[PDB]
Design a protein around this ligand. Structure first.
Ligand code: ZKU
Length: 120
């Protein structure tokens, strides 16, 4: 698999699977700043899966590493905002992070292998 462009559709498919996960519910759209009035005191850079999908479709990611950084920001924001590790939304974030990491590893490996083959 030395296709330099294959990661994009692989990331679209993975986002589709994350949207089917019930555990993505709290992360499908920008955080509700009315409900969580302190949110932007705690979180410098909001991120959500709809923003990640729109950035991908706009052609504004150059690599799957950049997409992976934004998805990891969704999860670090949830860990920063949680009042406890025994919270529903943080708990959903941890299962969804495990699912994401399990699926993104081959996407990153294949991309990096394709770049190395291009420069051979
Ligand atoms: O308001 C939303 N998301 C939303 C927006 C509109 C409809 C449904 N859900 N949050 C709450 C903050 N959040 C956290 O990570 C967190 C950790 C502990 C408590 O909340 C997830 C995102």
């Amino acid at each position: 698999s030395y296709d330099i462009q294959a990661w994009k559709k692989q990331c679209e498919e993975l986002l589709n699977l994350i949207f089917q996960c019930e555990d993505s519910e709290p992360f499908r759209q920008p955080v509700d700043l009315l409900e969580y009035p302190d949110y932007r005191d705690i979180i410098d850079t909001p991120m959500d899966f709809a923003t990640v999908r729109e950035t991908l479709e706009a052609g504004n990611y150059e690599s799957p590493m950049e997409l992976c950084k934004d998805v990891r920001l969704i999860f670090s924001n949830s860990k920063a905002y949680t009042p406890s590790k025994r919270s529903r939304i943080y708990s959903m974030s941890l299962r969804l992070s495990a699912f994401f990491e399990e699926h993104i590893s081959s996407v990153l490996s294949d991309y990096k292998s394709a770049l190395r083959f291009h420069k051979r």
